[PDB]
A paper describes a structure:
To structurally investigate the binding of benzenesulfonamides with CA VI, we have engineered CA VI-mimic and applied in crystallographic studies. The space groups and unit cell parameters of CA VI-mimic crystals were similar to those of CA II. There was one unique protein-ligand complex in the asymmetric unit. On the other hand, in the active site of CA II we had only one position of fluorinated ring – between Leu198 and Thr200. It looks like the replacement of Phe130 in CA II with tyrosine in CA VI-mimic enabled additional position of fluorinated ring of ligand due to a steric collision between the fluorine atom of fluorinated ring and the oxygen atom of Tyr130 side chain (the close contact found in the structure was 2.5 Å). The alternative position of the fluorinated ring of compound 14 in the active site of CA VI-mimic probably was available only due to spatial fluctuations of Tyr130 side chain. Also, due to a significantly larger size and the hydrophilicity of the side chain of Gln134 in CA VI-mimic compared to Val134 in CA II, the hydrophobic dimethylpyrimidine tail of inhibitor 14 was repelled in CA VI-mimic (see para-group of the cyan ligand). Therefore, the change of size and the hydrophobicity/hydrophilicity of the residues 130 and 134 upon mutation could be rationalized as the main causes for the relatively significant difference in the binding affinities: inhibitor 14 bound to CA II 40-fold better than to CA VI-mimic (Kd_intr values were 0.37 nM and 15 nM for CA II and CA VI-mimic, respectively).
Numbering used by the authors: 4 to 125, 127 to 261
Write the structure that this text describes.
Amino acid sequence: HWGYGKHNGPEHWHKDFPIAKGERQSPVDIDTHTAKYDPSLKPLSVSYDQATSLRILNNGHTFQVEFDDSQDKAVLKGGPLDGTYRLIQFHFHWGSLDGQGSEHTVDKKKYAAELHLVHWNTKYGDYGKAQQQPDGLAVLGIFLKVGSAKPGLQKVVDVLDSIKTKGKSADFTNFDPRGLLPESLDYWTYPGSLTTPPLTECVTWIVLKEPISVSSEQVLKFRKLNFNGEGEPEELMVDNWRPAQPLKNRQIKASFK
Ligand SMILES: Cc1cc(C)nc(Sc2c(F)c(F)c(S(N)(=O)=O)c(F)c2F)n1
Ligand SMILES: Cc1cc(C)nc(Sc2c(F)c(F)c(S(N)(=O)=O)c(F)c2F)n1
Ligand code: NA
Ligand SMILES: [Zn+2]
């Protein structure tokens, strides 16, 4: 079905998922000149001290690290958020080349990759229920640029050969996602959507200003994953990003400057 190829990529999605042409689609270009400092935003509270990772999965589109979300452990709050959002998983989007791969752009700049830490609003009880609500999810987006290796990423990079193909999973316990954060928690925020089908308009996006640095070797390893299942023709999992979508009426707010 949907994917990122010429035949089933982002410009095709609207035929199965009409909200693809909706009023709050993601990602977007972040025009840093037009974003407004909002002195009423609070600092983000990223509380990942008790995160419990469980598993890593190649889902055929990306790979995702999944967390135990059956209690309040790893939570995002503050900033533009009302209430408490629980971390359920993180995943990445990346390019076939270092000069593309991110979903959001900054003044049209593309980064090599983008990390998404997905959280759901605990007022809706479960992730699945939250995926249906306008303020159901909060996704923390972090850009990756190629430079110095990110030591906190290497445990993820090293397990990818065990999940090469669609539907493969591996145990992945005791991974600390604090090691994927940049120094600064300065951010942009705007209301948007899932960037993959079903493209539901349920996401408060929080995009950090500071990218993390990863090495060329780290991102090359992402590019060795496969979209296909085992035993099927090999198609490299690369360019699994949706381009920027129309901003429409929306305002992007800055936590800083
Ligand atoms: C490239 C390809 C491979 C296969 C196996 N089926 C298809 S048919 C198809 C499909 F199943 C889809 F789900 C989609 S979509 N709107 O992108 O979700 C599509 F465009 C399609 F063209 N296309
Ligand atoms: C709707 C749904 C349900 C489930 C269980 N996983 C997913 S995986 C996923 C995904 F692939 C994504 F790309 C995103 S994203 N880019 O953060 O909007 C997401 F939130 C996701 F949760 N999506
Ligand atoms: Na659940
Ligand atoms: Zn994503």
